[PDB]
Design a protein that fits this description.
mainly alpha, three-stranded antiparallel beta sheet, binds chloride ion, binds sodium ion, antimicrobial
Amino acid sequence: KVFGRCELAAAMKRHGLDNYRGYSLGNWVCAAKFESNFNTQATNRNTDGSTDYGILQINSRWWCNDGRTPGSRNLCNIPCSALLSSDITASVNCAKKIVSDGNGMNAWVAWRNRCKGTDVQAWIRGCRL
Ligand SMILES: [Cl-]
Ligand SMILES: [Cl-]
Ligand SMILES: [Cl-]
Ligand SMILES: [Cl-]
Ligand SMILES: [Cl-]
Ligand SMILES: [Cl-]
Ligand SMILES: [Cl-]
Ligand code: NA
């Protein structure tokens, strides 16, 4: 599924991400835009053989099981395929564990490089939330 901007803002709020760990909804929407372009089915292989999955590009190195990332963990206790669903529940639940891990949203390098410090409220501007 390819979400619209306000459609994703609304879904992230419905699953409790708005202001989760102090990160406003615009931060989450901006991170999704630059990680996946709002596409739930996005996958990208890393140089080290791990893969990033879904709207928030969650990495098999630590968070999900894809069966092909040697020495990896599965800390969200989910198959990485669950992160590709039209329903974002599994991605949100896992993202809440990642952002609690100690470095906040810096875990998402695209958030650090393209969202952190910027006018992230623009991402929810006009949305009926
Ligand atoms: Cl957009
Ligand atoms: Cl915001
Ligand atoms: Cl594996
Ligand atoms: Cl594990
Ligand atoms: Cl699995
Ligand atoms: Cl959803
Ligand atoms: Cl933080
Ligand atoms: Na893994």
